[model samples]
Target chain A: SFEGKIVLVTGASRGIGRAIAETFVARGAKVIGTATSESGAEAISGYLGANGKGFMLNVKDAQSIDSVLASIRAEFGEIDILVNNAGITRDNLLMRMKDDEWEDILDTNLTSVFRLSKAVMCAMMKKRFGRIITIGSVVGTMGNAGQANYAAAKAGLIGFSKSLAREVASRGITVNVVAPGYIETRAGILSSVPANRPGDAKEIASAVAFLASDEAGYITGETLHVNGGMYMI
Target chain B: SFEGKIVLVTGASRGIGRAIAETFVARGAKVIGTATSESGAEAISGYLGANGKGFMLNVKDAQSIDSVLASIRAEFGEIDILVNNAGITRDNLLMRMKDDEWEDILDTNLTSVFRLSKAVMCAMMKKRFGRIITIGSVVGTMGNAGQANYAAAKAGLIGFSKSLAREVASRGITVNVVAPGYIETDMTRALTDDQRAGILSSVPANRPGDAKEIASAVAFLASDEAGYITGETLHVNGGMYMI
Candidate 1:
């Protein structure tokens, strides 16, 4: 159980992010969830109550990220576990994809991660204990025709995470990526997946919780695919 | 058997690269092995004989890559398999690492791959059949002290390879990385008994891998039987690391 841990989950307004936040809250963690809008943040607070709080954060904006981090530190101590779940999909075929589409996806999905991870690393290194788990898509690994930008960014995360994991492994911090197949929330073609069904949000949440737990200390720089045999690597 | 197939292997003068080149030659493929120096290339030709040829290639140079690829095409037909086995290491702690140390590794180990793969991809796409196998290190997956730069480049190959694999999967081209553990090579030979013992303890096989073992795995991946496997990493480590 994460009894004394302070967790931070991005994009926790709904779907997989919400499930992850709730899972940690239930496991006795004080989760500070983030949403892009005030209403979404309030929704997170409503569902979490005393066990958690929510803040408005535009991950693309540096000031917004700083504000949220500061607020969380003031309210719930240092963040022991950080879940980099916030991401956006600007899916389009390579030929028709606009420059903005590619840039926006990379900036939000990939660059924002570098910023957030760097921001949290100092504290984590000082404490000599941390868990950094990023939510990745099956498209990242298997790739989709219209999601080249998304694939590049997601795949880039794996590379970036592995490098950072090596840099900080001796400090007792573990960084990993959890690539979900087609979760029920996002939906997909069932026939292609060996499981013949979409994965539950709770299932992804469980995997995130496991990585965040002390049990996964030795498993850094790994991409745990929860794809139900859709793609095995 | 790889009859009528043409294989291109970089850094094939000695070590694992040479083993891979020799393995393809033995399997009845026309192999084009590459080395940095003319003497090294001639040395590769010495053992390969009529079954294979050797060419000078400096992976760090774009014109040199183009020159070799053109020479291979004119001399040995289009390359059906490309093995990116050339890499260098500049190990240092993150705090003490020089800028050159980091950039050189990325440029040589990571960026050079993108160039070489792109160079060979168009032909493979047209033919609807090709295999691109990259040599990666266990340090890339498990991480090692004083080897952050090398680890990053090696680890980056996985992402780059996976992305490219997806892009060209429909074109009958497969891209993968073969990560090796402590193999009995020039590098491993330098290790003292204590260092060797420490590494062996972590390896469940309790033995250093032979270069030929890695060669066989590469051959398997390049074969038609393994056509279905794409965007995968086949770890040739002796149980030292597992996914």
Candidate 2:
């Protein structure tokens, strides 16, 4: 669906984030990615080539976001897409979890999405064309033991995504949440689970890529589950 | 609930039809009912009362539907509740199913509802308040073999109900569907154990529902509490798949 549009994907160095960036390139989108390290940025551009490349930025830093946004606007003219996929998990039983662990994940994952989405929403409103997609987690729908911080952040993303969907639906902007369950990136395969099977990272990427397409305009304020029927609703 | 209001139930003579009428009366909705026969009307009224009595109705014929509607409109002023509960099933394998059987079930179960809903729609719209609830079956959502006509009508209702709900939401009118999974009604219990178990296994609760449970859901839908819910289907299966 993407022929000449610009797409910005955060945390595009590896796993689902990396897959999302590559899929955009394959579909002919001007894939602009963010990597926290120079090595990751080089690999991203090497894979994406000079036509599409990466900008080193941090989602949790406002100055970093402002700096990246300035450079992206200078290069792409306007931000046509956003994939709020940068996230980190703080897994611990609630009782044993430290306040910093909880705050850090929530800040980097949930609060950072809010800031980034807020930063881009106005530009989208002015241009009257936009798509806000957040990659949430299955734990958001089905609460997990010893992962309260992670679950709460993912769940908050769903609430935030839906609320924003309703708020901005009339403005030609659509907000959606993609909740992936047990996606088997190399790290996910190592996690112990009853199903004990990791769904491919490509599955989550396709779902994210699909939501960012024009055909998905009618679908808003809904969570699209890409996990092999884990949370069937 | 329908405590003191006049609630009219269609086809209140026997089986699942009769149970809905009795349940409403027991809950204190002065129930005026319908029957296609004089004996059926008298018997249904006899168990109930003249205050909440029965009238003759043949929904296939418009004259009968109009006459029954007029009588209820005159006697009750306005129907506080309309439950499109009267329906018939003429099941047959698709290949051998007669055309009359297909047309007949459609006329009574599905089309008649459109007539009744249209008839009551203007009255409810003017009243600035009303509850129009439809009784949908689980089969409406999940397709079944040999019942293609029946399945289409039932599934069509979910779409129709949602459209009507949006059209009437601001007017104090709410249209919602209540899908009851396999229940312990005599007709349901008649199914073979293997057939029944197959249905049960799909349900998380692993059992057929009670008619009263479905009835209570109707009451809840009709209540002031459920005002916010419109154009939605409340599936009453313990753990069955949701539509």
Candidate 3:
């Protein structure tokens, strides 16, 4: 169903982002995966082959986002799906948090999503069909003490998508959030996920793919949580 | 959240269910609440006054539901919003759980929703609008050590709601679930203060939600503002369980 569809996935260098890009590419989408460095972008391009491309994107930068988006429109017509997966965590108690840390996380995690979704709105609204799926976190809904900044940005995404969902629903555009708790496929991740184990990146990718499909047309203004029974919403 | 609507709420004699019934009454919807006995039904009628009526309904019995539906439609007209709030819990560990206990909970909690939802679907579909909101629990998604049966039934309710939502969306009917956790109720009232404090300790909000908070969610989803939303579960936990 995703054949020839243009999909833009940010933070696609590794982990959940990489899995999302690869999942779409495998399902026949023309995936454009983003990373922070030239080498990181190259890794995405190398693995994606003819079905995908890679580009460097500093999500916090507006000009960088516009340039990459223009490039995609030039090469792939217009994006049908956008997966905002780029996020960063700055762990600090609210009382001890730094302003720079707060700004960086919000700009990258939340602000970039607003910019990207708006950037694609014209095309989607004109076509009268689009899917805006943002990647949120369990921490967003369930706040963690040390990661106050991350939680606020993640939680902010939920409210943002809901408002946007109502705005664009009449235009055949759907906006939603996919909140994944703990996917332990990556290394250096040490935390109790409460399900006795962590979920795989592919599991999270499956949910993104579903919400991005035509079958999910009736589903908007909602959050699909992919946690292993750790949370229930 | 309700205007000129006829609402049916099962298990509405007391607690969360009664709160839901009363909330709709306050919102100007004519409500038909059901309980298991004449006294229970009278209790609902006593409080709701002219805005609502009450009847006996054993959710596990198909004939009981059919008869109640026939009577309510005869008096109040076709139901527009149906709240599958009636449920029972048979708490037991997986190894020690009994077959009857599992069957009873599944029939009461999960199967009853299926039956009740199907009963109202055709009428709602004909009208091109409806709301099917089932009340679930936090344990359904977060499994408890001794609630294996209840958890299965509740989780099954969620999955069932999604499939039904898809089937009925084109007809303008929405199916959704509201999962509530640690609502201060008769059950919680009996707990020692120490036990209550421990229960609140794990919840990030550090408090139990009131029944009215959940009713507001039900009213929102039932409103026209939420028409585009379907096949979704809105969690009402106070940051206690985030998924």
Candidate 4:
């Protein structure tokens, strides 16, 4: 069950990331969350208490990740579970998409997962017990309107997770992705299209918790869709 | 658009088979729905009119299927689309599973697909145009608890599609599968809603799928725009279950 196990989550300030940290904490896991801002880190660390803390990390910048890697290792020791939940959406139609917008989305959503997972993959490999869960989107499976960049980055994560899952399954390191469909956040609650209905982020986090559990050791190299009928895996 | 083209659905007697026939008919496809009985034929002919006649076919019986194959070629001239949806499931866990359960499922689901596909592959190859869509399931993607027999049959269909797709894809025929999660069928509606909710809970999507959703996926794959898409299973289960 990895009780008291050290877990790392990126973008743990609000939305799915905050919900994920809360769910892990409820399960007796020792969590260390990451946010790009000092205020976000303070807010997360306050909620996590003494056993868990939040560290500042800008995933797009390679230098920021290097510092956070050392800090997380020193605070929590070897990471037992890693959830790549931190991502930014520069939402625009393909025609309206700027080069920088595309690059930032790619860097944050796709490459960031690759970099952080690669960093902890070896340590988890050394221990021969680790769980890597990447938070993707339902739109990735079925391309959506005005989200080609986001979709590409999210879809690429599945291919990356599959190859990584195949490569490391024998090593006791399981890689998987969870895609949520229109998770109901404040952003979603403000929308006008059938306001009563939406997928919840906590439900998606529950799936992550299950995947990180001992029973889910058999499950790997797979994508679990947590979207409330928005998309199928 | 199928327009003047013909779509052939084998084993269209009931359940999923009947749903597919109606979908193609609604879209103006010159459908030829086949069943093994006069009652089945009468039911289909009543709704589809003469353009969609019910031909007799027993997929397991080679002579029965072969005779129908010849008649189909003679009457229809050329068939453009083939949905290998004729399958049977014999459920039993591996330890207590009977050999007949395994063999029957393999023959009905796996071998029947092979025989009928082999019967049509040469002609589709000659025409250099065809859409081969097989019915698969989430159990094949993630092995289920009491479905070792069902899983193998469904899983083998995917592998068969892959191999056949590689062989004939360059010739313009696309072989694919429409893998559904738990759906609202007669068998499923029989389950108590409480029992059904348990099944739905395990699925992240929080709902059961409809047969028409599966049909819509097949319709898209059968269309010309999906030419580039081959050797894949277009999963349409409402995000409830995933692998």
Best by DockQ: 1
The CAPRI class of candidate 4 is incorrect
Residue by residue across A59-175, what tens digits does model 1's lDDT show?
Answer: 888899999999888988899999999999877644356657765776677666666777887789999998999998887777666675677667767766787788889899998
Interface RMSD for candidates 1 onward, in order: 4.1, 20.4, 20.1, 13.8
TM-score between model 3 and native = 0.53
| Candidate 4: segments with Cα more than 4 A from true spot | A1-233
lDDT at residue A11 of model 1 (Cα atoms): 94
- Report the C-alpha lDDT of model 4 over B1-243, residue by residue, as the tens digit: 667667888777766677887788888787877777878867777777866878777777889887877877787766788888777766543334554665566567666665666667677778888888888877666556455556655765665566567667788988888988877888898989889889988777777887777778888999989989887888777775554
Where does candidate 3 stray beyond 4 Å?
A: A1-233
Query: For model 4, what is the alpha-carbon lDDT of residue B203?
Result: 74
Clashing pairs in 4: A181-A227, B205-B240
How many Å off is the CA of A195 in candidate 2? Answer: 37
What are the Cα lDDT values of the candidates?
0.85, 0.73, 0.81, 0.76
Candidate 1, which CAPRI tier?
A: incorrect
Q: After superposition, how far is residue A217 of candidate 3 from its true place, in Å?
A: 39
Quality of model 2 by C-alpha lDDT: 0.73
**All candidates: TM-score:** 0.68, 0.50, 0.53, 0.52
Candidate 2 residue lDDT tens string, B1-243? 467666777887865566677777877788877888988878878877855888888878888887888887787667877877777667654335555665576567655555676677677778788787888776665545455445544544554465456566787988787887777878777889888888788778877888878878877887778888886778887867564
Report chain A TM-scores, every model.
0.98, 0.93, 0.95, 0.94
Candidate 1 per-residue lDDT over residues B82-201, each given as its tens digit: 999989989765556665776577667776666687788778989999999999888777777667667766766776677777778888989888999989998788989999899899
RMSD of each: 5.9, 19.1, 20.8, 15.8
Clashing residue pairs, candidate 3? none
Ranking of candidates on lDDT, top first:
1, 3, 4, 2
